[PDB]
């Protein structure tokens, strides 16, 4: 049941520039980098 529960629980890339300045920047999300 537990494994079955996990199996049942088991059931397109954009990022946002949080900060920028001085020629550098910080991005969030995007776990495919």
């Amino acid at each position: 049941x537990x494994x079955x529960x996990x199996x049942x629980x088991x059931x397109e890339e954009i990022g946002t520039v949080i900060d920028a300045g001085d020629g550098i920047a910080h991005v969030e999300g995007l776990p495919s980098v």
Binding site: X1, X2, X5, X6, X8
Partner: protein, 191 residues
Amino acid sequence: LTNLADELASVAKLLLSETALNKHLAEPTDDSAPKVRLLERLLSDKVSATTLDLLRTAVSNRWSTESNLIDAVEHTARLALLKRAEIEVDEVEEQLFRFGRVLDAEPRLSALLSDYTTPAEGRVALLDKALVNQTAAALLSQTVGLLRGERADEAVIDLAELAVSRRGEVVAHVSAAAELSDAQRTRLTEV
């Protein structure tokens, strides 16, 4: 007591939802009139009288850090639910302790216990389906809902510790190769 617990859960959830109110409500000041005025202006008719008084007292007092202000409501709700359950203590305590131990024994579910950016209620439904005393189940659901990137096994262990600490007894771990006799166990408790 159940209505008060529900109101406390709702107010804790809404407080956690927004960051600015926590930042502004943690300012260490002696005065309290603006804070209670803001509380009255911000949905003062959605809660009962006693819970409103308790929240007013909690906000009035000076808190060192916003983390304590956030955790105080949850602690109050948990202790209120425990007091309501008491009003069968031994059976509930044993059930909760064995349930926590047996669920922590399984490592796969513990791996799935990680909760961050997950749906707010989806994980609640999945965990309650995957896993009984009514009070224990309600407390478990409340603990699951209110966590934020923290260990669940430590959470259930701390919950059991608080539950046994409300009574006058002190928990003590005992390890032996096999279960002793009932008379021997009672003699050990006497010692």
